[PDB]
Amino acid sequence: MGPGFDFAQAIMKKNTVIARTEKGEFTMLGVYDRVAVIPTHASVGEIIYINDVETRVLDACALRDLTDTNLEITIVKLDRNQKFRDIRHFLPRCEDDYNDAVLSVHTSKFPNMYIPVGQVTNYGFLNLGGTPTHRILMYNFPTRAGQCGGVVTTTGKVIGIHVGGNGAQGFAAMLLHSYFTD
Ligand SMILES: COc1ccc(C2=CCNCC2)cc1
């Protein structure tokens, strides 16, 4: 509908795949080369389905901060014959608040879904499903099951991936440029 949805659509059309684990279908963001991200609660194993194709996992790392606190991001390297468009220059360098964000989802159940979530707060600490979690972004939209892995963007920035909700608010794990240096 407008330039927010334009940037979101550009990311979804080239830099997302549908990931399936034993815990469900997730929106998965490809960041560069064969490296993608997914919420840690997806429980990635040695094998994952990517757009319904059986795919070997070459590496999977559940990130924690230097307090040894959960970040709810898993970085996955996929054994596939192609590379993602490099979108690392759209990642923020520092923790921040944002205006006018879009949450975008693409699964079998919710294809081509875009949600204007509005203002995003650097919330920080969250007890997420019983697990102390840091670097959480919060938005005042009543997000429901099926939206985990959803990409949070502003115009020109990919800022997070959706990891939970409380029925009234939705929560995303930050993406930082420093997670994807090689
Ligand atoms: C490293 O694994 C990859 C990389 C890219 C893809 C994509 C397929 C179609 N649309 C673009 C993204 C799939 C798997």
DSSP per-residue letters across 129-142: TTEEEEEEEEES--
Identity of the residue numbered 43: S
Q: 56 Cβ partners below 8 Å, 6+ apart? A: 46, 47, 78, 79
Atom of ligand 1 nearest to the CA of 77: 1
153 CA to centre of own chain: 10
Cβ atoms of residues 104 and 11 within 8 Å? yes
Q: Which resolution in angstroms does this entry have? A: 1.4
Q: Is the dihedral of CA 90, 95, 99, 104 positive or negative?
A: positive
Nearest Cα residue to 117 out of 89, 95, 147, 76: 147
Cβ-in-10-Å burial (0-12, 13-18, 19+) of 139 comes to: buried
Say how far apart CA 143 and CA 115 lie, in whole Å. Answer: 9
Pocket lining: 88 vs ligand 1, CB cutoff 6 Å? no
Asked about 72 being catalytic, the answer comes back as yes
- In which residue are the tokens 């080239």 written? 14
